[PDB]
């Protein structure tokens, strides 16, 4: 549910759009994630491993 569950009840949202919104929150245009979704996923998988 992203961060919306901290206000009231949980609100559905797909994870890639939540990540795009987090990018938008730090001054990076949201097209960057959608153009580089696989690379970011692989980087996160390598980092957490």
């Amino acid at each position: 549910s992203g961060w919306t569950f901290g206000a009231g009840p949980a609100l559905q949202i797909p994870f890639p759009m939540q990540m795009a919104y987090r990018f938008n929150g730090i001054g990076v245009t949201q097209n960057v994630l959608y153009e580089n979704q696989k690379l970011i996923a692989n980087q996160f998988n390598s980092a957490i491993g």
Binding site: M17, T29, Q30, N31, Y34, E35, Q37
Partner: protein, 72 residues
């Protein structure tokens, strides 16, 4: 996540795309207020074959009818 019009991806300027079942709309995040998808609510970036989950629709340009009807 995006809407394709002429082979070019369209992303919402501020908001999330939404559909009630038949037509598509753009609205803000914390309140339901659908609006017609025009060329002022979206910005073009890239092409139509890089994004996963894109859909098809037509973005209404207010310039086209209002300028072509009068210019005749």
């Amino acid at each position: 996540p995006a809407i394709c019009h002429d082979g070019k991806a369209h992303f919402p300027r501020e908001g999330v795309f939404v559909s009630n079942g038949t037509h598509w709309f753009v609205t803000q995040r914390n309140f339901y207020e659908p609006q017609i998808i025009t060329t002022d609510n979206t910005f073009v970036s890239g092409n139509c074959d890089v994004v996963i989950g894109i859909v098809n629709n037509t973005v209404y340009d207010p310039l086209q009818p209002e300028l072509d009807s009068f210019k005749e």
